[PDB]
Ligand binder design. Sequence first.
Ligand code: HEM
Ligand SMILES: C[C@@]1(c2cc(CNC3(C(F)(F)F)CC3)c(F)cc2F)CCSC(N)=N1
Ligand SMILES: [Zn+2]
Ligand SMILES: [Zn+2]
Length: 467
Amino acid sequence: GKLPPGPLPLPGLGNLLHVDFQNTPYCFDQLRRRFGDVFSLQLAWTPVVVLNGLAAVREALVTHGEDTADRPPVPITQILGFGPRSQGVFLARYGPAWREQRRFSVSTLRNLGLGKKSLEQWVTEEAACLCAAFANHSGRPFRPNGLLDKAVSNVIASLTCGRRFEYDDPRFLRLLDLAQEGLKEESGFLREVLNAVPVLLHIPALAGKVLRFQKAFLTQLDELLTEHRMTWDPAQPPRDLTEAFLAEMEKAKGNPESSFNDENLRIVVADLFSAGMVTTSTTLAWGLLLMILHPDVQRRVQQEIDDVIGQVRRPEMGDQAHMPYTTAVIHEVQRFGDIVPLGVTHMTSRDIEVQGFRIPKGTTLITNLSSVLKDEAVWEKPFRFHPEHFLDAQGHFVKPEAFLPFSAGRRACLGEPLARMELFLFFTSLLQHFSFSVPTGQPRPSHHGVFAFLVSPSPYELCAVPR
Ligand code: HEM
Ligand SMILES: C[C@@]1(c2cc(CNC3(C(F)(F)F)CC3)c(F)cc2F)CCSC(N)=N1
Ligand SMILES: [Zn+2]
Ligand SMILES: [Zn+2]
């Protein structure tokens, strides 16, 4: 069939000069309005096809989900300990190694939450700690980001290692600091060039600098896992995912086909830890920013909170079904926030057909989630913070098909159920006890975010006054 259209491919750099790599989603909106919803790019040695709009994204990730659930090879991860039967979940190639870890994580999240509401309990308790840390800042403006990271990080640690850390814990702070630096290393120009040719990593000097913060994070994580292995009681049902992983590792002794080994444990845990730490935190940061930029929205949420929950009783997941406006606001935060504009890259394991065009096997697919969440043909006013995007005239919550912040298909975010819980419980608990506003004397903060692989809000301070 016909290959998708696109700008002129230069002999050497290809289409490297047609992309600014800063505000890339803005550049893709220009290419979409010039070549259509499915266009092509030649980024160096890599053939890339960009998918825009709900239809093009669904056609690849759902209709041809079997052929688009693979990941582009990342050779430099071998420094971190990545192997054939130890690829984790996030970067894992499409196959038995991914599916076993995928099915394990999805089911374990489900089991730890349905049995004794341990999922909901750790979040509820962490929200209370978050409220207290907010309370100590009262009377003075502050950046809420750091505290959001800690509260979000603790929820994960509660699911991985069955514990939380105090906000002033030296090892906790270091773990969080190393994590954020490790995100920046994955957004480096040096990475792409090093991803191209592996034997460049044979140079001792180069190999060391590649992932110095990321190796520090794993090392720090190893120390914590070793401690957790000591306190684990195999005679009891698993308290957390790591224990459940350890119990599987024992059963899989003598089986070289299993992905339940030591090398994969530290990688799967590092995956779950990082992925659900910077995403959920950033969203909560967006949520607070939008509440001080739109106080009228904040009051209506606080109104619905009182009419359903009160101001003393802690919020529960059962309350969400009775709070349609608050649900709309949270969904609109994710939509407007749009923290993962280009999603996570996929790769075709076969030849497929998207929107008539043909996509060769081994092609790197980019799902422009931004083009879906901001689609002007779907949303009433896509470039505004508008809670009524998820409400009808009567006030009922509706969820459009175009709400895809967690992407779609087999590779869709496995953390979504937990994310939904963290977002509702943290957001409601904060607004239940605090009124947020812009600090007087300071400029109105921009609703525009700083573009990266993960779009965070422009740096801002806020005032949190108790109620
Ligand atoms: C607001 C919160 C979150 C958002 C918006 C988000 C978004 C995403 C997106 C766009 C993807 C890529 C899906 C694809 O490749 O098609 C993804 C994958 C993933 N996310 Fe999330 N995520 C969030 C929270 C979390 C949490 C809380 C966890 C874990 C507890 C998590 C763990 C993962 C993992 C492991 C994957 C890879 C799944 C796979 O490759 O099969 N994320 N997420
Ligand atoms: C972007 C992401 C990510 C990675 C790290 C780095 N984690 C490491 C990893 F690269 F090994 F995964 C050092 C331990 C973060 F800190 C934050 C992230 F969102 C998502 C989780 S798994 C992955 N490969 N990349
Ligand atoms: Zn444990
Ligand atoms: Zn209705």
